[PDB]
Design a protein around this nucleic acid. Structure first.
Lengths: 141, 180, 29, 218, 56, 56
RNA sequence: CUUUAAAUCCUUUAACGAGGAUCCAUUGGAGGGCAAGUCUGGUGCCAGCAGCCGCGGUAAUUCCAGCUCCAAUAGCGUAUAUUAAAGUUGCUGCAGUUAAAAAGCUCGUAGUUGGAUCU
């Protein structure tokens, strides 16, 4: 049972803040060891420079080749594999290009089919991928 | 430092569940019945009702000889009689909880222009207000969600500069007179 | 017929669609 | 054509019982659905809540039946809830509408604050349980609507409750247990002793005793 | 389903002691199932199959 | 894997051009149009097919 | 004209100013969660979609498109922080036989909690 006195608030307030630490949603946002491990550092987006186009394989029950891009981030030098989303969207990218990268949507976890990929390309060469895919703009060289 | 006020306030709340049939259906019936433009004009009148229910529901926990309930509760019913939503014999604080959205939507200037017969449809009232043909006691009112008070219901008319009440014809009639 | 198409295809890929259509037929307006 | 097979059916069909509340007052079971069709009838309305395929393993595959959860009731009145399982979905729906007519209970409706007009809400806080689903109903002020999940909302609207606060603990995704727990909570409205039901009960004759001389003519 | 039910209710109203209607084929989809629309009594074995049950 | 097929189906698709139709409606008159479609002069007709954009 | 230091803007007024009133409304979607097409053409576990479940191996309700329909609407998608949903941190208000979990047992200081009784 729980303690239930009237002078027991120090037992109550301090049992909770030790028991709060077994909460993995609490710990991953308060310990600080998973924000120095995050490649962004707690930003929504980041920019980088494309090293190469590595295309990685889908997971078990369904087969395709997810076309990704190996990015090296500007602000801390870290490296990142980001997913180039729609079809024919690797054909707007060459090597050594500057790419704004987002998260995939699961807040630092992989999104189902793709293994170990937590980011997706947003803009290439300071123009948007939705502007290139839908033909609204032209790829600047 | 600036001499500006940053005090603003949102006037609507969006629902918790976005795709819910018979919420969609009921609000579409209230859009079509009263000539409104989008859902946000129903969510706005749902919000001023939810402020009035909530303030009366707070005042119902204080007892009948409270100071605050007797003052602020009589000033809540006074406004609801004044805009014509409540009647006069129903001024206990518990016929507030029997009010609905339609009581508040019947008091807009749009439906009152339709009710008095200055229009011939509920969408004909929206344009006749918005084209500046409608005045209230002296003043051209250009806003359809102008809640008509009870004393200003007897003075709603046709705006003495307009082709409908005043008489100087518009853009179209004069050009056809030029081509006569 | 939503009854038959549900009773046949409740097991297939089209199960969610035929359940949607069967509730549409049963509930109705 | 209806030919009643019970003493209660022979009494209802011959116009000898003038309401459903006599059959509720003497707590008698109802075995024929045409009694409910006789009394409520043209004001009753039903909704199928879920069609659920269930599968028995045999040595030649799987044998498939379909359960149907049917809610029913009269808005301002009464509510039922029936589950029938069969090989055809139309047969399951028809047997479930019979079973939902036979399990019709009356709901007691009270007031939240001041007692003006007609009742609108639950009289007190009642709870109802079915296998790790609790449902609690709480009385609500005049005009708040049913504040609840979509599945107990159909039953609470069919009962005639106009406004009610609700809370559900448990695995409420299993819809049969969530339907069968809010039905249990709105059954306990008429078995809760509030201090107006403290008056000593004045007894009257059972229908079987009052019409014991007409019931030997048949 | 509806078309076999109409025939079955006709040939049970007309006083037959029982019937059985089977429609086999690919009535929906590419794998082909069957149906079994049955009512009443139905004799399968023995010699009275020749004169009591009428098949087609 | 092999990156050579990228934009295969996007460039393989036969290019059909969009057909010119009228300007749709906007705003309050659009809401009036879809209220008139659904609520006033709803059709006394084959109910339970309440699936607008029903193909067949 | 008015406004203003002087201007602008809005308010007020001349004159011109709408029939595909081309003076065209967009952003996401149509398997289920979740409103709304097992329509037609293409591709054929490929390209790709998909938050999750799942979709695609030659009849794809899900990809690429055409039409049609839906939702919000001068706004609508995405990413990340955070709050509710979370009675999944629990004081209100959770759990601990078998699902994660009662210290091997006992003594013991601090802490916490302590039986009647007085006009």
């Amino acid at each position: 049972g729980k303690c239930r006195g009237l002078r027991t608030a120090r037992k109550l307030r301090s049992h909770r803040r030790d028991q709060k630490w077994h909460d993995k949603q609490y710990k991953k946002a308060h310990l600080g060891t998973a924000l120095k491990a995050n490649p962004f550092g707690g930003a929504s987006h980041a920019k980088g420079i494309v090293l190469e186009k590595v295309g990685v394989e889908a997971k078990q029950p369904n087969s395709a080749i997810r076309k990704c891009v190996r990015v090296q981030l500007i602000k801390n030098g870290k490296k990142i594999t980001a997913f180039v989303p729609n079809d024919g969207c690797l054909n707007f990218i060459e090597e050594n290009d500057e790419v704004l990268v987002a998260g995939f949507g699961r807040k630092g976890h992989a999104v189902g089919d793709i293994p170990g990929v937590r980011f997706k390309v947003v803009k290439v060469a300071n123009v948007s991928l939705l502007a290139l895919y839908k033909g609204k703009k032209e790829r600047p060289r | 430092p600036v001499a500006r006020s940053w005090v603003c306030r949102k006037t609507y709340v969006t629902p918790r569940r976005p795709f819910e049939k018979s919420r969609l259906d009921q609000e579409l019936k209230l859009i079509g019945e009263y000539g409104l433009r989008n859902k946000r004009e129903v969510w706005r009148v749902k919000f001023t009702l939810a402020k009035i229910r909530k303030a009366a529901r707070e005042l119902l926990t204080l007892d009948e000889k409270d100071p605050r309930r007797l003052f602020e509760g009589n000033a809540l019913l006074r406004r609801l009689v004044r805009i014509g939503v409540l009647d006069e014999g129903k001024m206990k604080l518990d016929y507030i909880l029997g009010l609905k959205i339609e009581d508040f939507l019947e008091r807009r200037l749009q439906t009152q222009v339709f009710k008095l017969g200055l229009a011939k449809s509920i969408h004909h009232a929206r344009v006749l207000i918005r084209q500046r043909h409608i005045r209230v006691r002296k003043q051209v009112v250009n806003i359809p969600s102008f809640i008509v008070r009870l004393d200003s219901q007897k003075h709603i008319d046709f705006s003495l500069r307009s082709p409908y009440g005043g008489g100087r014809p518009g853009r179209v009639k004069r050009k056809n007179a030029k081509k006569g | 017929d939503p009854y038959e198409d549900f009773q046949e295809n409740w097991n297939t890929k089209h199960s969610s669609g035929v359940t949607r259509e069967l509730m549409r037929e049963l509930n109705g307006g | 054509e209806w030919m009643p097979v019970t003493k209660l059916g022979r009494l209802v069909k011959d116009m000898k019982i003038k309401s459903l509340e006599e059959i509720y007052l003497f707590s008698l079971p109802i075995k024929e659905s045409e009694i409910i069709d006789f009394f409520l009838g043209a004001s009753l309305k039903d909704e199928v809540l879920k069609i659920m395929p269930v599968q028995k393993q045999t040595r030649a595959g799987q044998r498939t039946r379909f359960k149907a959860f049917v809610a029913i009731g009269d808005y301002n009145g009464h509510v039922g809830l029936g589950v029938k399982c069969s090989k055809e979905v139309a047969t399951a729906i028809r047997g479930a509408i019979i079973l939902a007519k036979l399990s019709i209970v009356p709901v007691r409706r009270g007031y939240w604050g001041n007692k003006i007009g007609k009742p609108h809400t639950v009289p007190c806080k009642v709870t109802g349980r079915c296998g790790s689903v609790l449902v609690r109903l709480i009385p609500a002020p005049r005009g708040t609507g049913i504040v609840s999940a979509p599945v107990p909302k159909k039953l609470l609207m069919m009962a005639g409750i106009d406004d009610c606060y609700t809370s559900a603990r448990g695995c409420t995704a299993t819809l049969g247990n969530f339907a069968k727990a809010t039905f249990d909570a709105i059954s306990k409205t008429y078995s809760y002793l509030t201090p107006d039901l403290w008056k000593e009960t004045v007894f009257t004759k059972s229908p079987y005793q009052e019409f014991t001389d007409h019931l030997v003519k048949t | 389903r509806r078309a076999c039910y109409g025939v079955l209710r006709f040939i049970m109203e007309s006083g037959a002691k029982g019937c059985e209607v089977v429609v086999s084929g690919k009535l929906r989809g590419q794998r082909a199932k069957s149906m079994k629309f049955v009512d009443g009594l139905m004799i399968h074995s023995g010699d009275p199959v020749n004169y009591y049950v009428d098949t087609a | 894997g092999s990156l050579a097929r990228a934009g295969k189906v996007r460039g393989q698709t036969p290019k059909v051009a969009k057909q010119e139709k009228k300007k749709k409606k906007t705003g309050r008159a659009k809401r009036r149009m879809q209220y008139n479609r659904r609520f006033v002069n709803v059709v006394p007709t084959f109910g339970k097919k309440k699936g607008p954009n029903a193909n067949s």
